[PDB]
């Protein structure tokens, strides 16, 4: 069902994360980590302290799709190096909420007030997505029955 998902997204903040290649998103899915340029690292650390949940919604450039979404479980911290394909700051730990894809064609009815009401697929890496549009975007994804949000809820 969708009820634990809606609970996780209650009063959350949402950020569009753009990746240049699929390999980086695959690494993030396997290891539960993300890293970003310093301008976005500061924004996400501020958001992590400000909100019950901070959700990163991932899209690989030119793919025409989002590749899933995850919740920050930590602020950034400077561990085992990660063989990203590229200056990058610290490492955020993340819990995946959905590892399934969603095509941009399916989110055409959602506009982001914090980016001039352009379709939510449009935005620079780090663009914040307003609460309502972000919640509806996350609910469009196909359910990921491999994930149990019980442990995610316990970290909030």
Swiss-Prot record:
UniProt effect for mutating residue 124 to F: Reduced binding affinity for N6-methyladenosine (m6A)-containing RNAs by 9-fold
Outcome of substituting residue 125 to K: Does not affect ability to influence alternative splice site selection
Processing after translation: Tyrosine phosphorylated.
Coiled coil: none
Variant or mutagenesis effect after changing residue 84 to D: Does not affect ability to influence alternative splice site selection
Subunit structure: Interacts with SRSF1. Interacts with SRSF2. Interacts with SRSF3. Interacts with SRSF7. Interacts with SRSF10. Interacts with CPSF6. Interacts with KHDRBS1/SAM68. Interacts with TRA2B. Interacts with KHDRBS3. Interacts with EMD. Interacts with RBMX. Interacts with ZCCHC8.
Function: Regulator of alternative splicing that specifically recognizes and binds N6-methyladenosine (m6A)-containing RNAs. M6A is a modification present at internal sites of mRNAs and some non-coding RNAs and plays a role in the efficiency of mRNA splicing, processing and stability. Acts as a key regulator of exon-inclusion or exon-skipping during alternative splicing via interaction with mRNA splicing factors SRSF3 and SRSF10.
Name listed for the protein in its UniProt record: YTH domain-containing protein 1
Organism: Homo sapiens (Human)
Native organism taxonomy: Eukaryota, Metazoa, Chordata, Craniata, Vertebrata
Section covered of the full-length record: 345 to 507 of 727
């Amino acid at each position: 069902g969708t009820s634990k998902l809606k609970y996780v997204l209650q009063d959350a903040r949402f950020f569009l994360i753009k990746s240049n290649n699929h390999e980086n998103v695959s690494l993030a899915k396997a290891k539960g980590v993300w890293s970003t340029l310093p301008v976005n690292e500061k924004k996400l650390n501020l958001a992590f302290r400000s909100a019950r949940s901070v959700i990163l919604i991932f899209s690989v450039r030119e793919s025409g799709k989002f590749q899933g979404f995850a919740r920050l479980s930590s602020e950034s911290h400077h561990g085992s190096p990660i063989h990203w394909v590229l200056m990058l700051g610290g490492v955020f730990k993340i819990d995946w909420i959905c590892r399934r894809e969603l095509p941009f064609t399916k989110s055409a009815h959602l506009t982001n007030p914090w980016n001039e009401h352009k379709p939510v697929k449009i935005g620079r890496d780090g663009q914040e997505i307003e609460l309502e549009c972000g919640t509806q975007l996350c609910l469009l994804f196909p359910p990921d029955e491999s994930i149990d949000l019980y442990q995610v809820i316990h970290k909030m």
